[PDB]
Amino acid sequence: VPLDGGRFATSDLNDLYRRVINRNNRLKRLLDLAAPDIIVRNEKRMLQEAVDALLDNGRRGRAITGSNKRPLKSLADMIKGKQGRFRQNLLGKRVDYSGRSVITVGPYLRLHQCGLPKKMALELFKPFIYGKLELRGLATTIKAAKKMVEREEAVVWDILDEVIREHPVLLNRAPTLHRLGIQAFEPVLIEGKAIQLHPLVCAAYNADFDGDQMAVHVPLTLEAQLEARALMMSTNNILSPANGEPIIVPSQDVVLGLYYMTRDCVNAKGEGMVLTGPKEAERLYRSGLASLHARVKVRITEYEKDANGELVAKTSLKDTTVGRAILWMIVPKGLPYSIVNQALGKKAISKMLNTCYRILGLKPTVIFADQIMYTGFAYAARSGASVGIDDMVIPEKKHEIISEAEAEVAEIQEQFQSGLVTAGERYNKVIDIWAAANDRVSKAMMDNLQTETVINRDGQEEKQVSFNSIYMMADSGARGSAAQIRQLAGMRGLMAKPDGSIIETPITANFREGLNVLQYFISTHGARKGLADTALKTANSGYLTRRLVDVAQDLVVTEDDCGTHEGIMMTPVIEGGDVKEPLRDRVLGRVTAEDVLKPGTAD
Amino acid sequence: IETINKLNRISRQMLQEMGREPTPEELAERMLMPEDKIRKVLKIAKEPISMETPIGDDEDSHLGDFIEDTTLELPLDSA
Amino acid sequence: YSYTEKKRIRKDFGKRPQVLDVPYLLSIQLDSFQKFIEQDPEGQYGLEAAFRSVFPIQSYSGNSELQYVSYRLGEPVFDVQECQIRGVTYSAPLRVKLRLVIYEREAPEGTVKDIKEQEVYMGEIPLMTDNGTFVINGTERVIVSQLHRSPGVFFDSDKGKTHSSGKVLYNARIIPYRGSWLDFEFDPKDNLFVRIDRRRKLPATIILRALNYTTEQILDLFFEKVIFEIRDNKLQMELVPERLRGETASFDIEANGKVYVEKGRRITARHIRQLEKDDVKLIEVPVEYIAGKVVAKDYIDESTGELICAANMELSLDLLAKLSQSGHKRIETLFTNDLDHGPYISETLRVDPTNDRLSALVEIYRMMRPGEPPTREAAESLFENLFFSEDRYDLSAVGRMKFNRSLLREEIEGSGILSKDDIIDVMKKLIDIRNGKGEVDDIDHLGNRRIRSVGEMAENQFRVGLVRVERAVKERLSLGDLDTLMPQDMINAKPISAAVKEFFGSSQLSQFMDQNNPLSEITHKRRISALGPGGLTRERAGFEVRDVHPTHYGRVCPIETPEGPNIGLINSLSVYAQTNEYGFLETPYRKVTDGVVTDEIHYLSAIEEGNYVIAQANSNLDEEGHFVEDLVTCRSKGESSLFSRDQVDYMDVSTQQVVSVGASLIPFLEHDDANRALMGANMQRQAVPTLRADKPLVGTGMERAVAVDSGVTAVAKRGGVVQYVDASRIVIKVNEDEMYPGEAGIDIYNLTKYTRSNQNTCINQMPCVSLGEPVERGDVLADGPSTDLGELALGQNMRVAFMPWNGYNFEDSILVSERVVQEDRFTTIHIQELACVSRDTKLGPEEITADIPNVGEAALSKLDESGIVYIGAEVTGGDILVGKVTPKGETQLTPEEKLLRAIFGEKASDVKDSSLRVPNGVSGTVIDVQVFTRDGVEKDKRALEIEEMQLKQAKKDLSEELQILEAGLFSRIRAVLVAGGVEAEKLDKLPRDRWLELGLTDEEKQNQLEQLAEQYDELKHEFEKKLEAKRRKITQGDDLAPGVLKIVKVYLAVKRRIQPGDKMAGRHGNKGVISKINPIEDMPYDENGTPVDIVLNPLGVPSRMNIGQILETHLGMAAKGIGDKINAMLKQQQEVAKLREFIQRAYDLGADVRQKVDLSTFSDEEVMRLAENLRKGMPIATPVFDGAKEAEIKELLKLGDLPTSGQIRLYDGRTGEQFERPVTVGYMYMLKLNHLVDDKMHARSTGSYSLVTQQPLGGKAQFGGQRFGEMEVWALEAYGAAYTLQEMLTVKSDDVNGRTKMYKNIVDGNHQMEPGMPESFNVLLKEIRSLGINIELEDE
């Protein structure tokens, strides 16, 4: 076949055929002469070898290359491996009615929605438009309609807004590990060229807004959009089928404001007084008369039932902060105040959602969580929340401790010089003392970061949790870990050679003091190994993943009860430490093998 | 074929002597025949180009991917 | 000091004094190519090595031979620039000298028989710019230095691959530059084995029998001999006393008349001591003590002529007697202690099947040529040519020297071929280190690894081309006539040029230069890889080579390498690095002398430092005396500890040696983690030069260096004075000091206006100078695309804050103002290229003219009549650039449109359209056109328009040039003609020209007449020469393809500015995507009313340890805390000396910093312009590890009348309140990236498809369709869906009926499905039926 320059391309297979023919008919020349059988023999050999090359070139032995100094393709090579027809053009397909783009954040959204640039959907939903334009009589036929699209009148945009309604969509992050890598959404559209996208589902994608991009497909026909509106929609998919936990953990800013809002300081004002309801609480905060973190006795209403699903009106008073009173103002009528007199780290908010699910279900739960996200962002903004140099704390007891450790290592240096301890003895000693020294420093700094606030406030001295940012980050659980904050202020413990083997003399400084060349030089290889083996977990992952699936691709449920008799027994795992998994919780969701009862027998 | 062989034997000498590739007119008038035939011979001479050649620097792409069936149909045209 | 220094000065806080100044950055490429091409009398590098290697070349048998003489490069045809234009390589040709030499082999040596000197052309050769690029077809292209395993000989050992054994397996390898390999090794079962070129395992001694050695000679050299003695009765022996070490006694090992050691008893060090001291070497023993030994060699009863014992044969007692009566009082034998002495070779001999040379040679011939029978001379010539032929084996003498090193020889040199002694020595060392003596080596130690730079590769392909040729010349010489056969005609020139051009343009090393930013350029030049030939591969690799070795320090950066698979392979270079004459690396070190720092230096390799001790740069030296404290951080042999002062030998120089440049410009890197700094460096190259070139305030000091040495921007090579200036270019004049006498003495510097990259970006130079102002050499004269005053700058400095904001900075996203986009200060420009083509066809040539049918004539309005647009025109998708038309066939039809044309009648003509147009969605502005046209073909109207236009433009360029030249020359004709008497006022009013003919005087006035006559001759000479030469340079056609007739090019442009979805980041790995802009009003603002530019999220700091950025921010603010103040003082307009004192106090602010400043020096004017340049800030230089500290900025902010913390008090803008607590604020330096939302977005509804398989294709420019792999399906059928993927696989990919039918259904308001069965399945069926398969399908 040609290209535009006139040159013909040629499937190398053609070569494999053509030579064959000529030899065959060349043989029929010699056969028409009854020549010596020697030439006959070697020609037979050549023929056999050629057919072998045709059917699998790299198999018999000597591999044929062409003019290119490169081997040729047999037929099999279109069937082998990844380049073969199976997993290149029979399963791994290219598709029409699609697109892709970069992602970004829509925070004002409702999580059953998505962002969308115009022109993308415009060209995607094009023939739909052509059809209903013919239906309305603006464009009599197709060419005129297409021209009007290229013309871009407001009628076109109106019709677009008509068609998107009810017409769902479907997304895909790259790559797809678990089935919640694609969810069905509804379209909402932006004068841009990127996609706004609800934040909470990033974890289901593991997507970070750092340059990621993702893809869009469309449910053309009817049953497709039914399945999308039923199943892959996000509201129908909140709990992992691997383990019955939610994937709607609110991540790191929402939780931050929730923590800042619910807090037991005393500092600001308005202590020791009363209200009738949360509304005037938020009122007077907007007026600038009392804090959010300020403890107060107030009124509360609430509801319960162990009845026949008939709520139990209830009302009383509670000692509480203000912000907790505001945060009461959205809970839907089934949960007490007992949930909210904490400071609300991650596990709490998760447990709240779990409660709303167990007791109410889905709609109220999603409504709740959406309001969570809203309120968290909004009140974290009001904070003022930042980082600086002075927020980092240097314990003055960081110099002497080093000096005593120094003197100890000097001592055992002279001891091993005398030749009494051994290398391993010296080694164990030194590592133990430096590790304990780092423990001592971490102790000092955490004792000088968490509760050092001496704020005199209708008292004289009371100890309460610190107002510094990074500790609020830590205890909140959004970002940070005691090791890492130690590593900003304290020195970096010790790091090892890339063998797993490890160093004698540790690090003695932090960032804020400023590293020196060797220390950075040494941290290099550690970081390198880290990202290195991070690079290629995925190969093994995908490969065994294919193995797993192509074992179990086929099985399915077909029946309710096999009518059979018992199988397994299950017992707890209490050995090694305390209990790690109850009998209680693993059997959960299973069935009963047999008539069983309680140690109080006949129950 | 033999014309091509003759021609290339000539052009070797021409690029000895000129320090350059030759011009069609020059070695043609030495070869005693007009430029059209030379030019067509040159249009004709080169071989095909092996569909499965890797235009991709690595094995990311073959050449057989980036062409189109500019022969078949079009749906809008059918409608 | 300099001038551009005085125009603006950057501040330092670096206190560590320098002793070395930075070198030129990329001397290595220059030096490599230089020594390649350049001549060499004896110290062979380059061409002459290859020529001397392969020449002379006798005939097939001897009669004729060729005799290399020497070579000549030749000047090029074009310059650089038109080669960049014409789509043509730059190069210089090559000529060589040859001599025929025939000698009458009928006679003995009848040499004077015929000789023909003739020179020969063969090959063009590309060339290196002054920067370091090459160029091909209008492409600056780069090749990269390689890094691989040195030649020589290596040892190593594996940890029991028979982990059953769990035991060490030693082996050893040789490596030439060229030829074949070997491999010696142990089996688990204590035997030596050998393999050539990873062939089969074979034993070792066969080689020795092949080298005409005898078994007795073998055991003579290898083993140390244990000698017996019989004296008619009893066995005595002669024991080296240190032979029982680590053993136990067998019999009563007893002195002459005395005992030392009983049976089963440890032979202590003292028993051996006493034997050593008692000078006894005759020990009486039993005879059966012999039982176990081996005979050294066959000793017979030579009376008989009968083998009583064969060599390598365990002794006995019958044979003992049998040779007792032979008359032999002893037979020498061997030592064997498994502890120290390994007899492995002897037990191997026992399995040696052969005895003769010949069978060994047979087996070698066999392994290397199976199936063929043996013939003597074949195997012999094979054996000797594998190792002893200079042609088929070469070491590249670095092998030779390090080989001599690893064998502890004194000698250095030799050949690229083998001895025998080498082989014995290496085997001996192997069996020693199997006994334990010595040590193995590692690979990653740079002393065992070597670069390979350009000129070497070039030599390689040059010589293989030569070899391709000499095969034929062997064919040609002895056959034909031998007196008429010219030397020349035996040569073809195609192969050498073929290999060279395919190397420079098709390897995996010739990469397109990256013209994003100068940093991209130079760091891409200062790359090292380990891929490609003689190299590595990721599947052949692991982690030990990926990872770091302690020897990289001072030679390679451990930071700068990407995040894909290509992790540890490539390695950017260090800074002060050099390579070595043999090709190794080395690094500068200061030397120490009795505690005094020897201020001179040395370059030290990867090895000697392992011997020495070395100190660091943090060492606070005690001012020219000794060093302050006893204990000093030093390192040796791979690790570090604390050492004395007098024990030290060397110290490092500066605190930058380890890093690369990209990892050097980052400030406060010390306070930053490694991985994020890696990311920030690799992020600092996908950037863009901004519309303007806004500078960074902070820095390090290594900015102007790279700015200059990238050569992107102009610079003066001679000091002098301006003479004319323009946006397009300048004109300079030189002083008298740098004045070559014979010349007119002016330089000149035209410029590069808007110009495409390889990455489609604008390129431009502009001055930063003015008129009538002086110059010294080295001074910049204009600024490239990303420079200001000869200081590098990619991005801009911007106001920031640190807080959450309503979710719009949730995960490391970004939020910005509209103030920016209305300042257009991240706006950037993007050139784009297009093309059309005229060809000759089956029917007729594609023509080009405006007049075409079925045209929107408004579109024709833009064109000329040639069918071509004008300049400066705006454009959009769908529009037309060029009207091209194609000869037509004839058209078959349908009754319907047939009827339509029955109604109307009008037709198409017999020509169709092929007109070029703007692609969909694209828009922009034209600024240029170009035409390339054949020779001999008519240049049409517009061709002549641009041709006489460019003739006029270039004739004008040369008008300017030649006019100002000859005007400088006419300075003669006043001082010279007014001389010779005088007629001055009477001269002047008259016409200038008729002054030769006036009152005429003595003889030297006639000398003047002849000289000026030659001058006015040279006038029209000059004019003729230059103008005509380039006029018919330009007038000609072109060199181009067959089928083509002419082409047309277009270079247009677009002014791209910011959207959402666009990436940006800073210099610390702080990535960032944009989420939205917002109006100025909703944004924050301080109490004083200065709003803020962008905002972002502080949660990312602890998580990532990208600390120093916030620190930078504090300092940023302080800069303008000075800068702002000055503008008040500027317009307050009080007085010079006030701000003089002020800024002098500013520079002298710091405590003990090494730069200084004295401003009584300057004028007032210098000061005022300096302040005029600083009124926007006070840029700073913070070195990397001689950095500043928070104390200084706190002090400097007390100076700037600002807080110590950088925390300040904010207000909401959307509702006017205050934030409950302060926030950190300042300016930081940010920059955008080459990842643009429109350079990533794409979508699709219907269009092209494949043909073999009929499924939609992939590619944005190609109208891609998205891919849907095999994991997405797993997900879907997990959800329990069938209809979706059913319709996905059938219609949207493959089925044809279905796609068409449903398109026409849904346009008819019907959402319905009608699948088929794909094509590719039937393709599979046909493919297997090709193979003899009766696959088929069974009905229901």
Side-chain angles (χ1 to χ4, degrees), chain A residues 390-401:
Chain A
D390 297 333
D391 297 332
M392 297 298 99
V393 176
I394 300 297
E396 193 276 330
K397 287 176 72 177
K398 186 175 181 180
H399 300 168
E400 295 83 1
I401 297 168

Side-chain angles (χ1 to χ4, degrees), chain A residues 4 55 75 78-79 85-105 107-108 120 123-124 126-128 130-131 172 175-176 179-180 182 193-194 196 199 202 207-211 213 217 220-221 223-224 227 231-232 237 251-253 260 285 377 380-390 467 472-473 479 484 487-488 492 511-518 520-521 524-525 528-529 531 536 546 549, chain C residues 543 546-548 553 558-559 567 616 618 640 655 658 670-674 677 802-804 806-813 839 1061 1063 1071 1073-1075 1097-1099 1102-1105 1107 1110 1114 1185 1189 1194 1205 1207 1219-1224 1237-1238 1240-1246 1249 1253 1255-1257 1265-1272 1274-1276 1278-1279 1281-1284 1287 1289 1292-1294 1302-1303 1306-1307 1311-1312 1320 1324 1327 1330-1331:
Chain A
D4 292 329
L55 296 170
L75 282 70
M78 286 86 77
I79 298 90
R85 290 285 185 272
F86 289 112
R87 59 175 67 182
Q88 188 66 254
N89 212 156
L90 188 58
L91 296 172
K93 306 299 297 302
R94 296 281 179 181
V95 176
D96 187 353
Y97 290 153
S98 300
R100 70 189 291 160
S101 174
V102 181
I103 52 176
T104 188
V105 299
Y108 62 89
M120 298 175 70
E123 63 185 358
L124 269 65
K126 184 186 291 298
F128 290 142
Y130 292 171
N172 200 165
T176 294
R179 69 172 187 171
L180 298 168
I182 66 182
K193 291 190 278 187
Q196 284 183 352
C202 66
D208 54 355
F209 297 98
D210 61 353
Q213 52 175 355
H217 298 281
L220 282 73
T221 192
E223 292 82 0
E227 292 180 354
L231 299 172
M232 285 81 74
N237 291 316
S251 295
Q252 65 188 0
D253 287 327
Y260 182 82
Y285 175 65
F377 292 159
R382 297 290 301 284
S383 70
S386 66
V387 185
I389 305 156
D390 297 333
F467 293 90
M472 292 194 293
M473 294 178 184
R479 300 297 302 165
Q484 196 166 5
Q487 180 167 357
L488 274 72
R492 307 177 63 182
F511 296 154
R512 186 175 181 275
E513 185 65 25
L515 279 293
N516 195 1
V517 293
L518 279 85
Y520 186 77
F521 186 81
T524 58
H525 50 79
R528 181 172 287 177
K529 185 183 284 291
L531 61 85
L536 60 89
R546 289 197 290 111
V549 297
Chain C
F543 296 165
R546 297 280 196 275
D547 287 330
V548 175
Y553 182 84
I559 304 163
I567 293 298
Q616 302 174 8
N618 305 106
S640 66
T655 188
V658 67
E670 73 189 6
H671 304 288
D672 190 76
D673 195 357
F802 285 92
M803 70 186 77
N806 306 119
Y808 292 109
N809 53 4
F810 177 63
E811 284 184 353
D812 70 3
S813 298
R839 295 187 287 106
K1063 185 185 284 283
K1071 289 179 186 175
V1073 182
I1074 293 168
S1075 295
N1097 191 352
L1099 295 180
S1103 292
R1104 282 77 177 275
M1105 299 175 189
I1107 299 303
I1110 67 95
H1114 291 98
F1185 289 145
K1189 188 61 67 68
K1194 289 177 183 178
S1205 299
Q1207 300 295 115
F1219 294 98
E1220 300 292 332
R1221 56 185 294 173
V1223 180
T1224 192
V1237 64
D1238 59 356
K1240 302 290 183 181
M1241 187 171 77
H1242 179 66
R1244 188 259 181 79
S1245 70
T1246 294
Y1249 292 94
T1253 50
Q1255 76 289 16
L1257 303 172
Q1266 294 291 320
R1267 183 167 171 80
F1268 189 88
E1270 59 180 357
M1271 52 177 69
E1272 292 80 1
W1274 298 345
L1276 265 70
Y1279 288 108
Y1283 287 98
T1284 58
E1287 66 176 3
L1289 295 172
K1292 297 191 286 293
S1293 173
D1294 299 335
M1302 82 183 294
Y1303 185 83
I1306 64 98
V1307 71
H1311 294 287
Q1312 191 171 4
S1320 65
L1324 182 63
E1327 284 191 352
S1330 63
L1331 300 171

Side-chain angles (χ1 to χ4, degrees), chain C residues 236-447:
Chain C
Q236 292 189 355
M237 63 187 289
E238 298 81 1
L239 176 66
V240 178
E242 61 270 16
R243 282 183 174 176
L244 273 293
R245 188 264 180 278
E247 302 185 357
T248 304
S250 66
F251 66 95
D252 192 359
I253 297 168
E254 62 186 0
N256 58 10
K258 177 180 181 180
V259 178
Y260 286 177
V261 174
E262 294 293 329
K263 279 71 64 174
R265 183 179 179 186
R266 291 180 175 89
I267 297 86
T268 65
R270 185 183 66 194
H271 299 96
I272 291 168
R273 186 266 183 192
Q274 292 293 112
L275 184 63
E276 287 176 353
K277 185 264 183 185
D278 290 330
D279 70 6
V280 179
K281 297 293 290 299
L282 292 175
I283 301 93
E284 302 83 2
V285 296
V287 298
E288 67 275 19
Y289 181 71
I290 288 166
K293 282 88 177 70
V294 183
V295 60
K297 62 180 292 302
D298 55 355
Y299 286 179
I300 59 175
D301 189 359
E302 288 80 7
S303 178
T304 64
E306 299 178 355
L307 286 176
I308 293 169
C309 67
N312 187 0
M313 188 269 285
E314 66 277 16
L315 292 172
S316 70
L317 73 172
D318 55 356
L319 193 148
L320 180 66
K322 195 172 183 178
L323 292 170
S324 72
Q325 296 94 32
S326 63
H328 294 288
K329 288 189 180 180
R330 79 287 293 160
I331 307 93
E332 302 181 352
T333 58
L334 308 180
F335 186 84
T336 293
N337 186 0
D338 294 333
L339 184 62
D340 190 1
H341 292 81
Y344 298 92
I345 192 167
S346 177
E347 60 184 353
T348 298
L349 287 168
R350 295 183 183 271
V351 175
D352 186 74
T354 59
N355 205 164
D356 59 353
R357 184 173 181 272
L358 278 293
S359 181
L361 296 172
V362 167
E363 290 288 325
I364 296 299
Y365 181 84
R366 182 64 172 276
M367 183 175 74
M368 298 184 74
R369 288 178 179 172
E372 291 292 328
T375 64
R376 291 182 68 191
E377 296 294 328
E380 289 181 353
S381 180
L382 183 64
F383 181 82
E384 64 88 21
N385 70 16
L386 285 175
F387 296 91
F388 302 158
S389 59
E390 289 80 2
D391 192 0
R392 299 278 76 75
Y393 188 91
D394 191 0
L395 289 178
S396 72
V398 296
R400 174 64 70 196
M401 59 76 61
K402 70 186 292 299
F403 188 82
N404 295 120
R405 291 178 69 84
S406 183
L407 276 300
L408 285 296
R409 305 288 183 80
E410 193 277 334
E411 292 80 0
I412 303 93
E413 65 190 1
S415 177
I417 62 94
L418 276 299
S419 73
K420 296 191 291 190
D421 299 331
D422 295 331
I423 298 162
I424 293 86
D425 294 333
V426 62
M427 285 185 178
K428 193 180 289 295
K429 190 173 175 187
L430 176 56
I431 56 85
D432 290 331
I433 192 66
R434 176 63 181 82
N435 293 325
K437 297 171 70 67
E439 68 272 16
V440 297
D441 57 355
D442 59 355
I443 65 176
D444 296 334
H445 186 81
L446 299 171

Side-chain angles (χ1 to χ4, degrees), chain A residues 49-64:
Chain A
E49 190 271 331
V51 169
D52 295 328
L54 183 150
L55 296 170
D56 195 353
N57 189 0
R59 188 174 182 81
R60 174 60 65 85
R62 184 70 271 178
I64 294 168

Side-chain angles (χ1 to χ4, degrees), chain C residues 769-782:
Chain C
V769 297
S770 67
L771 185 60
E773 61 185 2
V775 178
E776 295 88 5
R777 187 174 180 185
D779 294 330
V780 68
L781 300 171

Side-chain angles (χ1 to χ4, degrees), chain C residues 1103-1124:
Chain C
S1103 292
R1104 282 77 177 275
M1105 299 175 189
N1106 58 1
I1107 299 303
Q1109 60 184 356
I1110 67 95
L1111 195 153
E1112 181 187 0
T1113 305
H1114 291 98
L1115 181 61
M1117 190 170 65
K1120 299 179 297 301
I1122 297 165
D1124 287 334

Side-chain angles (χ1 to χ4, degrees), chain C residues 711-752:
Chain C
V712 71
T713 193
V715 69
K717 64 183 71 59
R718 284 185 292 176
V721 180
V722 181
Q723 189 64 255
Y724 190 81
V725 185
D726 188 356
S728 67
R729 61 107 181 77
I730 71 93
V731 172
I732 188 68
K733 180 176 186 294
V734 70
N735 293 317
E736 190 272 330
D737 295 332
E738 293 169 348
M739 189 69 197
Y740 180 84
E743 61 178 2
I746 64 96
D747 292 327
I748 190 171
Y749 295 98
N750 291 319
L751 302 174
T752 62

